[PDB]
Structure 1
Amino acid sequence: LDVLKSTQTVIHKALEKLGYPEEVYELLKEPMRLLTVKIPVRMDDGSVKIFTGYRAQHNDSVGPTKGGIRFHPNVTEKEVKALSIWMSLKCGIIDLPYGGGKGGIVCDPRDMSFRELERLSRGYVRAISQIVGPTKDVPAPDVFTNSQIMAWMMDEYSRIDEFNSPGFITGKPLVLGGSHGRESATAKGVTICIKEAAKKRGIDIKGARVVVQGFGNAGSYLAKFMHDAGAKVVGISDAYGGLYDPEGLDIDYLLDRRDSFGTVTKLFNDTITNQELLELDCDILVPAAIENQITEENAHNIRAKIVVEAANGPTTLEGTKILSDRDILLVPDVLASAGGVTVSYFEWVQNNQGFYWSEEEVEEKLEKMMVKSFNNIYEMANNRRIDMRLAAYMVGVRKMAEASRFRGWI
């Protein structure tokens, strides 16, 4: 209900800290291009259903907008605008030549079918075809979207434009112009941020104790990366509980027994709950799981020197304040989870060139980009006695404000 207001508040605070006037905030608080469309879709039963779609473009001064499309019944204009602004912030943090964009459709994919989903995706692409393209707006997947939906959208756009346009949409399969590293991008970015934070704090990664809350794809890849780097993972968690071993957890065996959903717990063995998993003795803590897990009660009980928010908003304002008081280095999600956006940008670059890179090239480029962003944010937060979250917000808004001023919009 207040997501847009909160985003506006953080934008205002960042602009005030940077010293920009109020006209910049007036321009950047709301997107300058919001489109609402009605999509008629023929269903399997033969009836026709009218779906509602939204597409918001926060800014285009830096470059073409970059956004995602989510198929949820609770989507709203306010949510779409707020997430477009957040995407702009992420792009500015990573220093991409992108703006912020966000798409949404009011639907229930659980009740929808394969052919109905294809028809809905095509209809949405048609409705927004007038303001999107490889040079205007680049969509990607979000909740209840995947490579098949991206491929359907790409086919729709090519069928409209009379020529193939792989760069119009990212998140595609490899055969259609996808990029390697699309699955381990977030985990690799989190690993890079963890390594940089450890270097800054003097903690040696070799033998460092890491706890990961969440063993999905991101959690599994992150645990594998720490194990390869030499850090010891002393705790993992899944939907059924967690495990604890100060001397190591045998990540190889855990991954071998890992199923599709990421379950690794045994049946007749007691498990460790997340509440006391977060309180374990470790140097690095990584919540990549459900949000609102760190609060006042557990902030003092947390024993981690570094906390990295792999998931979205796993920490509250009070928890951040307490961690800052306790001198615990917090890595915000807006920075940690930018690996997916970076890999989508690499996919766009590959589509533009016609040349597709390899896993090693993607790895090294992502490493350099994330390291530069992390170092810039850390230097900003050291020069100004503020938090990394505020520093990241300022870094995100600076590029957009400067581009708008240079182009003369304000």
Structure 2
Amino acid sequence: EPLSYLGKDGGPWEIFTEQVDRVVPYLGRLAPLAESLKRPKRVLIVDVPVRLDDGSVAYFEGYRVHHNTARGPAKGGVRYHPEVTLSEVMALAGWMTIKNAAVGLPYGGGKGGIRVDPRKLSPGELERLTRRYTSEIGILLGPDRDIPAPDVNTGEREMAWMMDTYSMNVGRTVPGVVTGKPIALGGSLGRRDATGRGVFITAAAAAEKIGLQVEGARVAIQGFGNVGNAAARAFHDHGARVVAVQDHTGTVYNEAGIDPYDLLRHVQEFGGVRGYPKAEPLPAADFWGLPVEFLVPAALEKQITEQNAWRIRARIVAEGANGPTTPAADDILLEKGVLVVPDVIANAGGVTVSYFEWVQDFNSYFWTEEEINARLERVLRNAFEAVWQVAQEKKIPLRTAAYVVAATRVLEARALRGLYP
């Protein structure tokens, strides 16, 4: 029986449950418990009424799903977008259960959304919306229950309002009720670069397993936003060189090496990578064929496909963006012997630092930049190592290994606790 409240096509949720299906062969004694993964623990649909600037009331659909809770409080961001749907928010929570268990955070999986176009609202209106939403899901929330975070179209500003609103309602300041707060509000050092640095940490852990030296290595990187330039800087700081960067404006190439800091100025200065004087322009499609040690897809989804996977000369692909390589491209890349570090752990840097933020918030005692990076390495190098060991011991690719690890840990937590009530 699929879930009756989704109707004939279950959409994004079906895609999630199919992946649980595919992981079932590798679960051993835990396999029967896998059924619990195909239904969310808790779905909460709330109305969120908002007095608009004219003084009239608008009504919005807000959601908060706790996909699974066996391993700890629900954790997962909150998205404002006109195309938000029950189905998607459930699926996304399902992915957070997987991601958080694969990287070894002490959390279950949760997500939230409000179906609204935030570009149609004033800053005032957005504030009132965040506040009402926070109040409405208040029965879910707590640093030991469910810790929202930023997602599509939300950030530090919204997170301050959730915090502030839960803290006023509840009668005390509780910084850890959300993460991705500003520093001033109990936020954490090292958030901005977390993800791009974690791509490097995980890429470099793979390189040691295959005896690839980092100091010599060449790097090509797609996307130069927060993740891309952070990855760029880390590779460049460890002795590697960035020989090409592609983004939405154009592509630039220089086998001798591009300076990430130098390029970045130009990126805000003009708008994109195009016209960087210390490199030559390159056609969109050739980027993928460059002889490199490291390729970092850190931009849009569906960028390494059946159409170009044969062109890839990289020894290691480290996934910065969510889902940059298609299932077809995986098969091709496995064939060509290229190591793919899956988005699941490769991009987990941000979620790890927000875990760090939750942690510092309990006794309001904040860590230095350097303790953040050191502890970020410990978490992600341990996640790469556990995913590597499973990939070897079961003869599956790293991506399949990541989902086996995740499911295995959630299902072990559940087997231990037992069924109660």
So what's the TM-score if we normalise by structure 1? 0.97
Q: Provide, for residues 259-315 of structure 1, a one-character-per-residue CA deviation record: whole Å limited to 9, x for no partner.
A: 079623228997323321111111110010111112223111111111111101111
Q: Provide, for residues 40-59 of structure 1, a one-character-per-residue CA deviation record: whole Å limited to 9, x for no partner.
A: 10011211100000100012
Tell me the residue number matched to 1:395: 405
Tell me the residue number matched to 2:319: 309
Q: 1:334 to 1:48 in 2, by over 3 A?
A: same
Q: CA deviation at 1:408?
A: 1.2
1:170 aligns with 2:179: yes
Q: CA deviation at 1:130?
A: 1.0
Q: Provide, for residues 202-258 of structure 1, a one-character-per-residue CA deviation record: whole Å limited to 9, x for no partner.
A: 111012010001111211111111111010111012221111111111333212333
Distance 1:31 1:393 in 2: 18
Q: 1:64 to 1:102 in 2, by over 3 A?
A: same
Q: Structure 1: 5+ residue runs without aligned partners?
A: none
Q: CA deviation at 1:134?
A: 1.2
Tell me the residue number matched to 2:349: 339
1:108 aligns with 2:117: yes
Tell me the residue number matched to 2:299: 289
Q: Structure 2: 5+ residue runs without aligned partners?
A: 1-9
Q: Where do residues 77-92 of structure 1 align in structure 2 (5 Å cutoff)? A: 77-92=86-101
1:98 aligns with 2:101: no
Q: CA deviation at 1:354?
A: 1.8
Tell me the residue number matched to 1:321: 331
Q: CA deviation at 1:21?
A: 5.3
Q: Where do residues 132-147 of structure 1 align in structure 2 (5 Å cutoff)? A: 132-147=141-156
Q: Provide, for residues 303-348 of structure 1, a one-character-per-residue CA deviation record: whole Å limited to 9, x for no partner.
A: 1111111101111111100110111000111111111110011000
Distance 1:363 1:189 in 2: 9
Q: CA deviation at 1:158?
A: 0.5
Distance 2:280 2:218 in 1: 22
AA aligned to 1:372 is N
2:388 aligned counterpart, secondary structure: helix
Q: CA deviation at 1:13?
A: 2.1
Q: CA deviation at 1:409?
A: 2.2
Distance 1:158 1:207 in 2: 51
Tell me the residue number matched to 2:4: none
Check the 8 A contact 2:41/2:69 in 1, yes or no. no
Q: 1:103 to 1:275 in 2, by over 3 A?
A: same
Check the 8 A contact 1:213/1:278 in 2, yes or no. no
Check the 8 A contact 1:240/1:271 in 2, yes or no. no
Check the 8 A contact 2:205/2:381 in 1, yes or no. yes
CA-based RMSD: 1.7
AA aligned to 1:3 is P
So what's the TM-score if we normalise by structure 2? 0.94
AA aligned to 1:76 is T
2:385 aligned counterpart, secondary structure: helix
Candidates 231, 254, 258, aligned match of 2:263: 254
Check the 8 A contact 1:184/1:218 in 2, yes or no. yes
Distance 1:100 1:165 in 2: 21
AA aligned to 2:297 is P
1:369 aligns with 2:384: no
Candidates 118, 127, 130, aligned match of 1:121: 130
Candidates 394, 401, 406, aligned match of 2:416: 406
AA aligned to 1:380 is V
Q: CA deviation at 1:22?
A: 5.5
Tell me the residue number matched to 1:359: 369
Tell me the residue number matched to 1:48: 57
Check the 8 A contact 2:247/2:273 in 1, yes or no. yes
Q: CA deviation at 1:121?
A: 0.2
1:184 aligns with 2:217: no
Q: Provide, for residues 139-186 of structure 1, a one-character-per-residue CA deviation record: whole Å limited to 9, x for no partner.
A: 000000010100001010001100011111010000100000110010
Candidates 229, 239, 244, aligned match of 1:235: 244
Distance 1:66 1:106 in 2: 20
Q: Percent identity?
A: 47
Distance 1:4 1:361 in 2: 38
Q: CA deviation at 1:25?
A: 2.2
Q: 1:93 to 1:260 in 2, by over 3 A?
A: farther
Tell me the residue number matched to 1:199: 208
AA aligned to 1:147 is E
Q: 1:178 to 1:49 in 2, by over 3 A?
A: same
